[PDB]
Amino acid sequence: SGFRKMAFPSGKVEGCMVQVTCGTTTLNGLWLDDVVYCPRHVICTSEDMLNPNYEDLLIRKSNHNFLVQAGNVQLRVIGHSMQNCVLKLKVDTANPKTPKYKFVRIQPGQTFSVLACYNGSPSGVYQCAMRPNFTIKGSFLNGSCGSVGFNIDYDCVSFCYMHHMELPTGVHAGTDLEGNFYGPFVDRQTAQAAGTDTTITVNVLAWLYAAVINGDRWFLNRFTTTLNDFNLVAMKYNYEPLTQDHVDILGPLSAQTGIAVLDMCASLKELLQNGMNGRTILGSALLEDEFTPFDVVRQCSGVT
Amino acid sequence: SGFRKMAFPSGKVEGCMVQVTCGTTTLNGLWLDDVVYCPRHVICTSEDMLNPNYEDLLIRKSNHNFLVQAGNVQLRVIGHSMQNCVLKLKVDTANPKTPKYKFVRIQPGQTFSVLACYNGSPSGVYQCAMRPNFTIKGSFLNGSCGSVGFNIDYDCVSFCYMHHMELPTGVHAGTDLEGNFYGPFVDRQTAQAAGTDTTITVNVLAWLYAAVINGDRWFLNRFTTTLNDFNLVAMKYNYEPLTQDHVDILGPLSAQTGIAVLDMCASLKELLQNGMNGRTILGSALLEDEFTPFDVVRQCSGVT
Numbered sequence: 212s213g214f215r216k217m218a219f220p221s222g223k224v225e226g227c228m229v230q231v232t233c234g235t236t237t238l239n240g241l242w243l244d245d246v247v248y249c250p251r252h253v254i255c256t257s258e259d260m261l262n263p264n265y266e267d268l269l270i271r272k273s274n275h276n277f278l279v280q281a282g283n284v285q286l287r288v289i290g291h292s293m294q295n296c297v298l299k300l301k302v303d304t305a306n307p308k309t310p311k312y313k314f315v316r317i318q319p320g321q322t323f324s325v326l327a328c329y330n331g332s333p334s335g336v337y338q339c340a341m342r343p344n345f346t347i348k349g350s351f352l353n354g355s356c357g358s359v360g361f362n363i364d365y366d367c368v369s370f371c372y373m374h375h376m377e378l379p380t381g382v383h384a385g386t387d388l389e390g391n392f393y394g395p396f397v398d399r400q401t402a403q404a405a406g407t408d409t410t411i412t413v414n415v416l417a418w419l420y421a422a423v424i425n426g427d428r429w430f431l432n433r434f435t436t437t438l439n440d441f442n443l444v445a446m447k448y449n450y451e452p453l454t455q456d457h458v459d460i461l462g463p464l465s466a467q468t469g470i471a472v473l474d475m476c477a478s479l480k481e482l483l484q485n486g487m488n489g490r491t492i493l494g495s496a497l498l499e500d501e502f503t504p505f506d507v508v509r510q511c512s513g514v515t
Numbered sequence: 516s517g518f519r520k521m522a523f524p525s526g527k528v529e530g531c532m533v534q535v536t537c538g539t540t541t542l543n544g545l546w547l548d549d550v551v552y553c554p555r556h557v558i559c560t561s562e563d564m565l566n567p568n569y570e571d572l573l574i575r576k577s578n579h580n581f582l583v584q585a586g587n588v589q590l591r592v593i594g595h596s597m598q599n600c601v602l603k604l605k606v607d608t609a610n611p612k613t614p615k616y617k618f619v620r621i622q623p624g625q626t627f628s629v630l631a632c633y634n635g636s637p638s639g640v641y642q643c644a645m646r647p648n649f650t651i652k653g654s655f656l657n658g659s660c661g662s663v664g665f666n667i668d669y670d671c672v673s674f675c676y677m678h679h680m681e682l683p684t685g686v687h688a689g690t691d692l693e694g695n696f697y698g699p700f701v702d703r704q705t706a707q708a709a710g711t712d713t714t715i716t717v718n719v720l721a722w723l724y725a726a727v728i729n730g731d732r733w734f735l736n737r738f739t740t741t742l743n744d745f746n747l748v749a750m751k752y753n754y755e756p757l758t759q760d761h762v763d764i765l766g767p768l769s770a771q772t773g774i775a776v777l778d779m780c781a782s783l784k785e786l787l788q789n790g791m792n793g794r795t796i797l798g799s800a801l802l803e804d805e806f807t808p809f810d811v812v813r814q815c816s817g818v819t
């Protein structure tokens with residue numbers, strides 16, 4: 212029993228973190244096989260960020276300008292290329308600590324763990340969700356760029372995020388491991404306001420099922436609703452519309468607890484309309500939306 | 516910017532996790548040097564837990580009865596001893612992945628990371644605090660026993676907790692790495708109710724300073740208070756009394772933000788008396804108490 216915001220064990224990712232320096236800029240790189248992945252803005256000075264021409268800036272850079280250090284040892288750079296907003300630095304040595312890995316581009320609402328790093332060294336690990344507006348609410352300071360987000364299935368690490376920037380509103384934007392930004396963000400220091408941060412309805416329901424499994428049941432009521440009726444409430448409270456696909460993904464949780472998805476939607480509807488009345492659910496005084504239905508099943512079953 | 520419940524990178528601890536089986540019971544062990552540490556209740560059957568005589572149960576066990584597996588390879592057990600509520604299994608091979616380590620017995624209010632494991636395999640990592648009643652609010656299922664709590668200072672892992680049991684109330688009890696339980700708990704299946712779970716006042720103040728650093732300032736008011744006046748409020752709301760030692764530990768946060776500790780106590784006092792009025796602080800709708808002043812400084816400065 213108990214339910215926590217749990218991150219994947221970070222060891223497999225720690226063995227991939229390196230430090231990349233270009234000129235006076237130092238950030239984090241991800242070393243997998245004989246390639247180091249890092250944000251392309253490593254080639255910029257703070258002044259360049261206002262309007263950088265990355266292709267032009269990269270012409271003045273040679274292999275010997277990218278200083279790649281793994282712990283206390285220096286990697287030899289034998290090639291460099293830009294793929295979208297990431298640089299790929301070919302090194303002469305395959306990372307001996309390279310785990311089984313994949314590069315995946317996640318969908319909004321999906322969760323992942325972040326290993327925050329500075330100077331190629333890990334500082335901490337926490338669980339995040341890709342918000343519906345494609346930002347992440349992380350914890351990053353200057354130097355954290357190149358820190359990565361990932362999920363783990365048994366022995367395979369699926370890398371989904373690489374940190375690039377902080378928006379003026381304190382939220383975070385970044386790319387997948389192919390260098391494509393999530394959302395409309397660009398790696399430029401300009402007005403990039405975020406869209407509406409809606410609540411991930413399917414995750415709140417999954418977390419409500421997690422609460423029932425762990426003993427927190429005060430919010431269960433005598434009511435039911437329909438998808439269309441629930442969605443009228445969800446729209447009013449800036450919640451994502453719930454679809455039949457979401458109901459289907461909640462099936463195993465519905466089966467385990469014996470509480471039909473639409474009955475749980477009616478509990479959520481009353482919680483939205485009436486609030487928590489000074490009460491808590493799984494130690495939270497608000498509706499948590501950064502646990503997917505898969506996360507709840509995983510934590511509640513003990514998948515390693 | 517941003518503030519998250521961050522755990523230490525778990526890699527150094529992942530390399531120490533092993534599976535220990537005795538008879539029909541399997542739990543986690545911690546392999547450091549040529550010794551495997553595990554909860555002594557590994558020698559019990561579920562029936563034995565009602566009133567176990569560990570010394571008598573251990574007489575029927577020989578070195579060959581403790582099956583210790585590290586990944587897919589078997590460790591040879593050349594000695595066994597019981598130290599308080601932990602068993603120390605001497606193996607013939609030093610763990611090559613043994614990090615620099617210490618065993619520390621933490622004080623209530625202190626925080627630590629937990630690497631939850633099942634069958635010697637890690638499932639996840641999360642940040643915890645030793646509650647003032649000596650329980651921990653974790654996330655553990657059957658098989659998680661032997662999972663450990665730790666802190667990391669640069670390259671040294673300080674092991675502070677080993678998981679032993681779940682109380683009937685869903686909270687968790689365990690020992691330090693010398694086998695001594697935190698609090699009055701015993702490794703017996705009996706009525707062991709927990710004392711008052713008070714709020715760690717010094718941590719709430721540290722988190723309020725973290726909020727100011729990250730932009731959340733609505734709770735700052737025009738008032739001040741005294742230690743004795745604040746403590747009258749703290750007693751009413753089951754908060755730990757604030758001492759001059761706590762004020763002293765909050766000094767660096769007070770210095771960074773320019774907000775005197777007693778002024779922050781007056782903000783906390785008004786938050787206790789009036790509530791949050793439907794507002795949030797660092798994404799929480801309640802006063803968070805599982806960040807120490809050291810945690811706040813560490814996260815806000817980027818210590819790796």
Ligand SMILES: Cc1ccncc1NC(=O)Cn1ccc2ccc(F)cc21
Pocket residue numbers: 252260351352353354355356375376377397398399400401516
């Ligand atoms: C300081 C900080 C805190 C947290 N996370 C990241 C950062 N760093 C940055 O944002 C660096 N940086 C500055 C301007 C700019 C423009 C575009 C871009 F891709 C990166 C940019």
Ligand SMILES: Cc1ccncc1NC(=O)Cn1ccc2ccc(F)cc21
Pocket residue numbers: 212556564655656657658659660679680681701702703704705
């Ligand atoms: C099932 C579970 C869930 C979460 N964390 C731990 C557990 N396991 C246990 O508590 C095992 N166990 C059962 C009786 C008993 C008595 C004393 C003791 F030290 C261990 C005991």
